Design a binder for these strands. Structure first.
Lengths: 204, 178
DNA sequence: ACATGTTG
DNA sequence: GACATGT
């Protein structure tokens, strides 16, 4: 096989916009306790900018027990429970209380395991087409909160051979909401990808 | 208009379970100092069967006595003394019937009709019921009553409390559905 | 007790 | 709807 090295601190240590963009095309890898490796190529992300960002958990420099990850070293995972039963997987970027949410993966490996995991918690485009869908598919839960994506043995990021060029990256309004921050183009996805959670035609 | 009287001692002077069930479909009325009348149909209650505290004296008074207490230093719960040593019924939810706009300004996001009275503390806020109501008599008070029309109220579910919680089956106004 | 925040 | 979290 090819020489494989994980993306580390150097990759994660950039501001939220460039990081959210840089994630696109990179391959998120999960290794289950049974040894099964799950891979999904990132096709959709969102930037949360920090204190000024009315939509961010870190609005006004607010640090709470839950959102510790957003204020930890870049690369630190911030995984929280939303609507009681779903997870959102974020990665702390450079910048006070700034992070990147992963929203959608093209599944590459272990699709049958992703299917088993999600059906318990059917189509391939249904597996990772959403921030909480992808968490289920890759057995990611709160136990991953505050772990380091640069160093962890169970989850890591690999440089992916297929990165979108600037013109192929769509910038669009974020999903799930405010004010001027509900409309800001802080969601980024690969143009024409069928794995993306929500298409935005006006932005395209 | 119809000949309206109010429910009195005879209605309230029953055990906590019969009364908690009997409250469902009755209309609670609150008249504000400005003359505005607020109305809400009781759709969810809880019976408390008793075993004496400086705060629970209300539930140890004659049936129909209000027991209103502060919880989490902010909210209110409205309870009505029934027959039985220390027994009472909590009001948990109302269907808002009139004065909804007042209910909204008293409660004030954008909140809809289903958010006005869908909770024991929501309903007290909505009907301006506070501590100054504690130990008042529901059968005789001038600011708050349980009205009685020429028609009886209109299906009751007995569930665990939040089988001593009772609510109108499938009502969109019940706080928590089992 | 309340207010509020993706999936299907 | 969840139900985890933040006066």
């Amino acid at each position: 096989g090819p020489h494989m090295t994980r993306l580390g601190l150097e990759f994660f240590d950039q501001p939220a916009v460039p990081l959210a963009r840089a994630f696109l095309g990179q391959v998120l890898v999960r290794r289950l306790p049974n040894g099964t490796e799950l891979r999904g190529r990132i096709v959709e992300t969102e930037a949360y900018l920090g204190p000024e960002d009315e939509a961010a958990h870190s609005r006004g420099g607010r640090q709470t027990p839950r959102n510790r990850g957003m204020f930890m070293k870049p690369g630190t995972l911030y995984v929280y429970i939303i609507y009681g039963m779903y997870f959102c997987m974020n990665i702390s970027s450079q910048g006070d209380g700034a992070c990147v949410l992963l929203r959608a993966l093209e599944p590459l490996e272990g699709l049958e395991t992703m299917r088993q995991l999600r059906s318990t918690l059917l189509k391939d485009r249904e597996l990772c087409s959403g921030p909480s869908k992808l968490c289920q598919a890759l057995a990611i839960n709160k136990s991953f909160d505050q772990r380091d994506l640069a160093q962890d043995e169970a989850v890591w990021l690999e440089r992916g051979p297929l990165e979108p060029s600037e013109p192929a990256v769509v910038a669009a309004a974020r999903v799930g909401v405010a004010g001027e921050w509900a409309r800001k183009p802080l969601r980024f996805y690969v143009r024409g990808s069928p794995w993306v959670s929500v298409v935005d035609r006006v932005a395209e």
